[PDB]
């Protein structure tokens, strides 16, 4: 129960994480205690204000050695970005972390591309990420892996758009929309090659809205989106066939796999096919300019 | 002094009093590097280089006040930092070369992006880490080569790490020019994660490479490449204590005819030595050490595959042959027409050898060539066994039978 | 930071744990790598509540973590285990005896492993890392190891010991899911980084597959894939590396596309063979002549024209797709011929996304399709075929003709 | 003429003594060593930084506020006290400044002078992050009174990568004459390490360059690890044990591996020689 009013901070960073050694003894002795626990850090939105920093701002003359770090029971909210990873963001674990109300787009949480020797199992467990005022999750670094257990992600985006070899695993994790109107997508993996998202378990709760005018899932071509024991959510707001043509869940032209997953066909409102690449027919869509199959 | 805190706010100010003493306190606005005096021109229309001259927006030139050596910072580099640093060191290099001074980078990491190749002209001006492990990180850039060294002394490139990321078509360094007297040296580089590291091209200058390590390449051609057609290049390429080595499929291969190669104290280890010239080419290894260490691969230390007139010498050093399921085929394969002289080296022999697979019968060495060998010596106190090295060493006359019948 | 020094304890283990606050916390527990020495020991030497051991490091032991006989439920949290004596030195459950492992770090073994021995025994980690190690499992019967985003890696290591060695007993199950599986560039990986024996399992579910240029798996299997073994592997939303520049290899021969891929079958059943009009072309089933000599070959020998052999099976999208054969080029006039691979759908149509790779004119076994037999499933086909083209006058040898979609 | 362009102090005692207060400050040191004109430069003073003190680059004044050295180009001992040709042990200063140049992968340059090496402590090279170099090859180091096993270790930290990047980028040891008084027990030079190791060192490509090692015992012994060494222009001379010019001990691990000297010359008449007693090695 430790609240610190940053409100009058001008810095660029109020915490930064990051070892002072290459090796010995941090290998020893990153994991015996957490970092930061137990600290409630909020500020004023102050532009160029961030909270917490994973990593350093520029590379070391070294590595630094990060692996089993923690962050526990520890809320960020109304900075510039709350949570930013940086040079040497390797195996930091986060539990039960709180992101909120930040102001940048990327604000909740975000992983700039270009970072040194990070990218190896951030993990997260019990965490919300949560604001409905433009800030979203980004991850732009390549060749970076992030598992997140029993989090949530309320009234965000998740954006990945890694040059390459991005995976993010969810387990148990639940995507809702409480109390918005937008029609935000939940999951947007935009650009890159061999990036990988992994829904597994958890819930994806679509509330009423105008109209779902857009696919709230989308994966890129050459980008892969796994869903594995999770049920396809349906509304009768569901507009997707604006931006894609056809009435389906998620969009792009990535590839998308299906295991254990149900359909809500007990909806009244109907149900809706997940995406292009689960075709059961050849030539479902005419493509190939003639009546063949 | 009236002071600036970035380049860029000393370039927007409306400079007017001429021989003005203002500081710059950092090129980059609050890192603190780059700095320095500057006194304000009026007269001067020397061209901007946002080093040494700076050119504000009013057309005043501002002249840096120099008291020491020339820094890539000055220029605007930004050392362990994200930013593209390859336009600075660039623009540094030109003036280094310019002035007739060598270039010094100090340690640090340093991103180069673009396409654009740094030229040095070792007639003028080296790259000199100056002084320790400099990297210089090329995984983003998506040129045709990184560096090339041409003309048309101080080593033209010493003390730098430059690596890349694999990418298809990004060739490290290319000594010479692409397109048909002097003496310059390439000394303590690594060159790693190109498509080709090294690659030879058209260049009257003598090279000699001194402690100079290649590895890791895509192309199968990627750790060292002199390929055919380098009708200019009459000079010996010598190569003094360098290791090649770890190639992951890349390996050396020495295509142009009529050309000579020197390696020294040299190390040739998980990659194979390709000659296919056409006609007349020379490879000379002195002390030098062929082997397959910790991936006890099968692959072939020395293929002379094409061609006529190829000589290839091993003379002293080492042939070391780890254990695997089976060594399937001779590590040394010499071609018709061609030959393979070994002078005071040790043959090595293990049980796992399995050459008859390939030959049809037990022999270290392949193919229709000639072998010679002057002071070699077998392992004849290896419990595995000796075999013999090649059919143009037979003792004995119709020893496969090839005349047709059972004559001698 | 607390720092118990146990380098000149000699006793047999330093902590039992044996019957909600955890048992140890907050503790950096090392040896002096004493033989006999132990570290943590959880349970009993000799024959229902729930404990946990959190924040700990256990480094230098002989063992630093064993397992005993014990009913409490364990859960480990950010726990560190490196650089320990013993070859099961990391963490040792032996035999005769849930396990829960979430953000530990088991790494920097030095020869030190994790093995597990004991049947009918279930280990979960999650968010666990296993660096320059291997993760053994040779249990009798029925073990399951779960991994759920688990990182696999060997990071500044040389050596090419395996990542998971699933090497003894029947119904044993690893799993893999999401998480990452990174291989750095190494002197060849000459061996299969995962290894499944027969009656075994490995499930991979939502994770990248990764390929580099130093794979050399063929060395020990004969051919080219990554995972090793005759068990089985199961794959589910895995990612191929299909862009990647020095290529990509399928996973396991238990996902072949295409029956009789190795013609263990002794014939050359389900394989077309169309001679054309090449009446007197040869296409025939060459018992012990592969890459091991231990295996079934086919050799093509086409005269006047080409010869085609092909085969076609089921398939369909979603799905990636990555094929590897060995080829042993005799002799040929110019390039030997072409292997493809293309698509249809169940009207015969033929469907965009074919591949093809030519077969060159090098002799001796080599691997092919690397990057050219690899792709994306194409969404409405039906039917995947793959075609070997021998052209006239050249006498080819054909074995482990291997592809994989991956998809369940 | 009395003004300054920064805040000048005529020592690092001075330095430390004075209660620095204004973070971000640039203060000049004109000399480590009050008058001696040597190890000076510029400063920044940092309140925030809690980087550990070293009397060289990083400086703790007396009241805990750091002050940290601008430093362009390689580490030099002076910066850390060491001082040309005086009866003090130099050892210590130089050692210090190695383990800094070392933990910023920098080499260490010493100035033109003879130092006196003392106590018994190595000095272990790492060659993947650093060596020391004598300015103008004109460095002496008098180890008459050093009573350690060896002065100098030449072995990498690492088992393979970054060592097959950076053992080669530059020297380990270079422009160094090194003697001693062949005192029973005391070595030259140990290329590589005393005892195995748990993993293996990547030494490959280190070099030893313009040196001479004088009147040890084993004037340049090798150990384990000790492969793709090269010594350019090392001379070694006048040393205790027969085998003292250059010793290869049987039973060395992961080691033989082309052993190369160019324009090397070895001297004696007094009983020392050169003996290669280890299997499998190439010179």
Not at chain 1, 165 to 173: L, Q
Not at chain 3, 299 to 306: I, Q
């Amino acid at each position: 129960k430790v609240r610190i009013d940053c409100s009058e901070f001008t810095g660029s960073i109020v915490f930064s994480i990051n070892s002072s050694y290459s090796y010995t003894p941090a290998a020893y002795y990153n994991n015996l205690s957490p970092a930061l626990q137990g600290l409630y850090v909020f500020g004023a939105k102050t532009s160029g204000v961030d909270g917490l920093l994973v990593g350093r701002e520029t590379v070391g003359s070294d590595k630094s050695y990060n692996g089993q770090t923690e962050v526990r029971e520890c809320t960020f909210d109304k900075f510039d970005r709350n949570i930013r990873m940086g040079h040497n963001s390797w195996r930091f674990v986060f539990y039960k972390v709180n992101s909120l109300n930040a102001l940048s787009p990327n604000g909740i949480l975000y992983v700039p591309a270009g970072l040194d020797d990070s990218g190896e199992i951030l993990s997260f467990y019990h965490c919300q990420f949560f604001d409905g005022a433009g800030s979203n999750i980004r991850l732009s670094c390549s060749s970076y892996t992030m598992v997140f257990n029993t989090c949530s992600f309320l009234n965000i985006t998740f954006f990945v758009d890694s040059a390459s070899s991005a995976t993010v695993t969810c387990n148990g994790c639940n995507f809702e929309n409480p109390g918005s109107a937008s029609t935000r997508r939940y999951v947007d993996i935009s650009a890159g090659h061999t990036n990988v998202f992994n829904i597994i378990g958890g819930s994806i709760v679509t509330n009423s809205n105008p109209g779902q005018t857009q696919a709230l899932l989308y994966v890129s071509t050459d980008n892969l989106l796994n869903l594995v024991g999770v049920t396809a959510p349906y509304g009768g707001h569901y507009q997707q066939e604006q931006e894609l043509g056809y009435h389906a869940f998620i969009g792009g032209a990535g590839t998308v796999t299906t295991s254990g997953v149900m359909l809500q066909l007990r909806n009244g409102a109907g149900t809706c096919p997940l995406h292009s690449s689960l075709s059961t027919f050849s030539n479902w869509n005419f493509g190939y300019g003639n009546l063949n199959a | 002094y009236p002071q600036f805190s970035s380049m860029a706010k000393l370039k927007a100010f409306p400079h007017s009093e001429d021989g003005q003493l203002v500081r710059l306190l950092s090129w980059h606005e609050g890192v603190g590097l780059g700095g320095g005096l500057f006194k304000v021109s009026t007269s001067s229309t020397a061209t901007g280089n946002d080093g040494t001259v700076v050119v504000a927006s009013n057309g005043v030139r501002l002249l840096r006040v120099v008291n020491g050596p020339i820094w890539a910072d000055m220029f605007g580099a930004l050392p362990n930092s994200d930013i593209d640093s390859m336009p600075a060191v660039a623009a540094a290099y030109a003036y280094a070369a310019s002035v007739n001074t060598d270039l010094y980078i100090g340690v640090a990491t340093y991103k180069f992006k673009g396409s654009t190749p740094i030229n040095v002209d070792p007639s003028r001006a080296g790259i000199i880490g100056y002084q320790g492990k400099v990297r210089i990180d090329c995984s983003e850039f998506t040129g045709s080569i990184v560096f090339s060294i041409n003309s048309s002394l101080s080593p033209a490139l010493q003390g730098l790490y430059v690596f890349g990321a694999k990418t298809s078509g990004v060739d490290g360094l290319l000594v010479g020019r692409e397109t048909v007297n002097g003496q310059t040296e390439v000394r303590e580089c690594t060159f790693d994660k190109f498509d080709r590291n090294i690659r030879m091209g058209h260049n009257s200058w003598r090279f000699v490479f001194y402690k100079v390590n290649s590895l890791n390449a895509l192309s199968p051609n990627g750790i060292l490449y002199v390929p055919a057609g380098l009708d200019d290049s009459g000079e010996i390429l010598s190569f003094y204590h360098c290791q090649f080595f770890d190639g992951a499929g890349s390996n050396i291969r020495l295509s142009c005819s009529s050309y000579t190669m020197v390696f020294n104290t040299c190390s040739f280890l998980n990659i194979t030595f390709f000659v296919d010239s056409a006609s007349s080419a020379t490879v000379t290894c002195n002390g030098c050490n062929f082997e397959n260490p910790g991936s006890a691969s099968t692959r072939r230390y020395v293929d002379i595959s094409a061609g006529h007139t190829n000589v290839f010498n091993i003379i002293g050093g080492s042939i070391v042959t780890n254990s695997n399921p089976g060594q399937t085929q001779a590590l040394l394969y010499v071609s018709t027409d061609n030959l393979l002289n070994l002078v005071g080296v040790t043959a090595p022999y293990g049980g796992h050898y399995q050459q008859e697979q390939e030959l049809g019968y037990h022999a270290f060495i392949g193919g229709a060539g000639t072998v010679t060998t002057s002071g070699v010596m077998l392992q004849l106190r290896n419990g595995a066994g000796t075999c013999p090295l090649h059919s143009s060493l037979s003792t004995f006359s119709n020893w496969n039978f090839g005349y047709g019948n059972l004559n001698a | 930071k607390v720092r118990i020094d146990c380098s000149e304890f000699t006793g047999s283990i330093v902590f039992s744990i044996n019957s909600l606050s955890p048992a140890l916390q907050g503790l950096y527990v090392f040896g002096a790598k004493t033989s006999g020495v132990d570290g943590l020991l959880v349970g009993r030497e000799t024959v229902n509540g729930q404990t946990e051991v959190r924040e700990c490091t256990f480094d230098k032991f002989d063992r630093n973590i064993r397992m005993g006989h014990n009913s409490w439920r364990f859960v480990f949290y950010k726990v560190n285990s490196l650089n320990a004596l013993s070859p099961n030195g990391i963490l040792y459950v032996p035999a005769g005896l849930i396990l829960s492992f979430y953000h530990c770090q088991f790494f920097d073994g030095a020869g030190s492993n994790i093995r597990l021995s004991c049947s009918s025994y279930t280990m979960v980690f999650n968010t666990c890392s296993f660096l320059n190690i291997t993760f053994f499992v040779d249990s009798a019967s029925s073990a399951t190891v779960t991994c759920n985003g688990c990182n696999f890696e060997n990071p500044g290591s040389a050596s090419t010991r395996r990542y998971v060695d699933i090497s003894a007993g029947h119904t044993n199950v690893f799993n893999i899911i999401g998480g990452s599986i990174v291989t750095n560039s190494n002197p060849g990986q000459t061996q299969a980084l995962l290894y499944v024996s027969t009656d075994n399992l490995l499930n991979l579910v939502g994770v990248t597959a990764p390929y580099g240029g130093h794979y050399q798996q063929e060395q020990e299997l004969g051919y080219h894939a990554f995972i090793g073994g005759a068990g089985t592997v199961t794959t589910s939303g895995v990612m191929l590396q299909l862009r990647n520049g020095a290529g990509t290899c399928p996973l396991h021969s238990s996902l072949s596309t295409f029956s009789n891929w190795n013609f263990g079958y002794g014939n050359l059943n389900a394989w077309t063979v169309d001679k054309g009009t090449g009446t007197s072309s040869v296409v025939e089933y060459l018992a012990n002549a592969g890459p091991k000599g231990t295996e079934g070959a086919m050799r093509v020998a086409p005269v006047s024209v080409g010869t085609n052999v092909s085969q076609v099976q089921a398939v369909t999208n979603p799905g990636m797709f990555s094929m590897s054969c060995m080829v042993n080029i005799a002799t040929t006039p110019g390039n030997a011929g072409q292997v493809s691979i293309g698509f249809l759908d169940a009207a015969g149509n033929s469907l965009p996304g074919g591949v093809s790779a030519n077969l060159g004119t090098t002799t001796g076994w080599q691997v092919i399709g690397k990057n050219t037999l690899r792709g994306k499933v194409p969404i409405g086909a039906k039917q995947v075929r793959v075609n070997i083209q021998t052209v006239a006058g050249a006498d080819v040898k054909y074995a482990y003709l291997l592809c994989n979609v991956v998809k369940p | 003429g009395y003004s300054v362009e920064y805040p000048q102090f005529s020592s690092m005692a001075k330095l430390k003594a004075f209660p620095h207060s204004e973070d971000g400050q640039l203060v000049r040191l004109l000399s480590w060593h009050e008058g001696v004109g040597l190890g000076g430069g510029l400063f920044k003073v940092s309140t925030s930084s809690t980087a550990t003190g070293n009397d060289g680059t990083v400086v703790v004044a007396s009241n805990g506020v750091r002050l940290l050295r601008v430093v362009n180009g390689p580490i030099w001992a002076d910066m850390f006290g060491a001082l040309p040709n005086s009866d003090i042990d130099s050892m210590p200063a130089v050692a210090a400044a190695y383990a800094y140049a070392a933990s910023v992968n920098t080499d260490l340059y010493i100035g033109v002078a003879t130092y006196k090496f003392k106590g018994s402590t190595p000095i272990n090279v790492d060659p993947s992050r650093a060596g020391i170099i004598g300015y103008q090859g004109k460095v002496r180091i008098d180890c008459s009174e050093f009573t350690g096993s060896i002065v100098f270790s030449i072995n990498s930290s690492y088992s393979y990568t970054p060592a097959a990047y950076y053992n080669n980028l530059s020297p380990a040891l270079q422009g160094l004459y090194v003697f001693g008084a062949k005192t029973s027990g005391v070595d030259g030079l140990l290329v590589g390490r005393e005892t195995v190791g748990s993993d293996k060192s990547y030494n490959g490509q280190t070099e030893v360059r313009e040196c001479t090692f004088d009147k040890f015992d084993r004037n340049i012994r090798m150990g384990h690890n000790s492969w793709r060494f090269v010594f350019y222009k090392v001379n070694s001379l006048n040393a205790l044990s027969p085998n003292g010019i250059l010793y290869v001990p049987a039973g060395l691990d992961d080691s033989g591996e082309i052993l190369s000297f160019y324009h090397c010359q070895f001297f004696d008449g007094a009983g020392s020689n050169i003996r290669l007693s280890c299997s499998s090695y190439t010179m």
